[model samples]
Target: GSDHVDLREHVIDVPPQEVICKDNVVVTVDAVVYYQVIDPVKAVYNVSDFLMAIVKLAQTNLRAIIGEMELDETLSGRDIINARLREELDKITDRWGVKITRVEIQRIDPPKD
Candidate 1:
């Protein structure tokens, strides 16, 4: 078995064009996401690579969610987004018995370029 190594990558961003609703507040995020092993058993027995699956899932979900909202909504609705993401991710992770303890957006950027 190989030791799992996590790669800290680039900041996740949402451009103003990505935000559709004008009445809504637009926001972008730059975060340092930390993904650590929670379940050694599942990591060892169930999944070939637990880290990859979880990270990919998170990335996909984030894109899906952020893509659907307007800039204003993404900004004003950030807390909502945070909660929803946590809930959705938690529900998904429940099956694997892997928990995500923290899902935070360190900063929400302006819609300006």
Candidate 2:
């Protein structure tokens, strides 16, 4: 048998990034984000397809928005970004009366320096 085994343990904490600034400033913050519904009609009928469009929106917007964020900002200010994102999405889809319930960030990964 191989020495290593495929396994995952209950995670109590996740590792944070080590960012170095020019003046030796360091920032470390962890964030949990969630969204709440502002409107109902918009979220219901705005899109031609509901669930599929929502899933697509989540993936596309998630990557787009994440790409714009700094590592520390993403890790620390997830809640703010989540809210802004939900707002932006709701605004975009408002023509069909779609509203965003909210957003939640389940994980954070900082890219290698």
Candidate 3:
């Protein structure tokens, strides 16, 4: 036996992904999304891997989102992205009986070249 996995404050790390900015420049991004699984039934049955959609959703929006901003615009525009993602992510989780507690980026790097 081991410690029980928490249904509350569950953490998911979306792998690093690439995006092109409005300026037509390339950048790298990723995020840490925290959520709560209120029901095991919907979490397991209705969603094969909530984390799969949840984590993947993080970067999906990250790419599609920040990509809309300029290269420099995204560097300090992180909070905007964080707030925006939680709302979008919550929309999906809400239907699946989950709650998005938090969203933060691990990196938002621009091209060095």
Candidate 4:
């Protein structure tokens, strides 16, 4: 109904993020986050922009998490990173009535040159 907020599943596209690894490798990462609204009231009132909030949070966390690890770890530790990102993001968005179902890294690439 138009009167009620839709608590539906949605995908948020994360823009490319550039971070320097512990070993001084500059890499760009891209991602897609999957989430659903668990509470309509909170989704409607708690956050100004649900999708933008998710995307912003994802971008912020991506840089922090990726910046902390070495190049090898950044390349090989996608699962761990995704989980960590989701966990951290969940803590913030919980009050917003959103439940993050999954976070996936679409690509992690280093400069060719």
Candidate 5:
């Protein structure tokens, strides 16, 4: 028998990053990604360290997306952000047989100064 892959639900915690929004306001955004493996073969072989790849990809896109929006938008448009993240992520992860169940923006904190 071949070595079985661990196909279980997983969560990735993304560290907060400072994103400069409109008006040069800097905010730290923290996020979490929830995912599940639907196809063990693809999930195991299609990508090395699928979890890590996904997390890193998410972080990169987070910066790019949030960087383009205004402070007020980032502050109030969490759901929109989540949906856009999932949609874009699904397109990438589908090849690896992973489904992004949800993306949660845990917090967005403005700079103290």
Candidate 6:
């Protein structure tokens, strides 16, 4: 019997999300999160939809975070945003026996007004 589940590092790219910031500016942002499943059992059993779950969770936190920062702050504090996203994801994924490497902000559309 040959059975295998990939536990290697995988990356999920969040779609471009729209968020209205504290300054009432619309910003389009997207990110890619890299994660590795430490425990295959937990990856399969604990999460019914691993990739979908990760992306949605990432989107939720991304939008939630962008909503707080002003358009200016978002552009300038990009590092902080990425770091916090990693933290947010790490906290939740740890429960599923998964650890993420780092999250990358792929795009940050300049608010054109």
User: Model 6 reaches what TM-score against the true structure?
Assistant: 0.80
Clashing residue pairs in candidate 6 (N, C-alpha, C atoms within 3 angstroms): none
Runs in model 5 deviating more than 4 A are 1-8, 45-48
Q: What alpha-carbon RMSD in Å does predicted model 1 have with respect to the real structure?
A: 6.7
Candidate 3, pairs of clashing residues: none
Clashing pairs in 4: none
Cα lDDT tens digits, model 1, 39-95, are 656646444344555556666666667657665555677666666666666677656
C-alpha RMSD of candidate 4: 3.5
TM-score head-to-head 2 vs 3, winner: 3
The Cα local distance difference test for each model comes to 0.53, 0.47, 0.76, 0.77, 0.77, 0.78
Residue 97, candidate 1: alpha-carbon lDDT: 50
What's the true lDDT of residue 41 in model 1? 68
Among residues 3 or more apart in sequence or in different chains, the pairs in candidate 1 whose N, CA or C atoms overlap within 3 Å are 19-71, 20-70, 24-72, 25-71, 25-72, 26-71, 26-72
Cα lDDT of model 2 by residue, 1-113, tens digit: 54556332111122233343233434332322222323444545434454455455544555445545565666677677567656666666555554555555556544445
Q: 14 in model 1: Cα distance from truth in Å?
A: 14
Give a tens-digit lDDT track for model 6, residues 18-73.
88888888778877888887876677864546668878887888777877787677
5-111 per-residue lDDT for model 4 (tens digits): 76566777778877877777778878787788788777786445867777888778877877777756766888998898888888887878887887787766865
lDDT-best of 4 and 6: 6
Candidate 1, residue 53: the lDDT equals 58
Write down the TM-score for model 5.
Answer: 0.82
Taking every candidate in turn, the Cα RMSD to the unseen true structure, in Å, is: 6.7, 14.2, 4.1, 3.5, 3.8, 3.7
Q: How high is the lDDT of residue 111 in model 1?
A: 56
Off by over 4 Å in 6: 1-8, 45-48
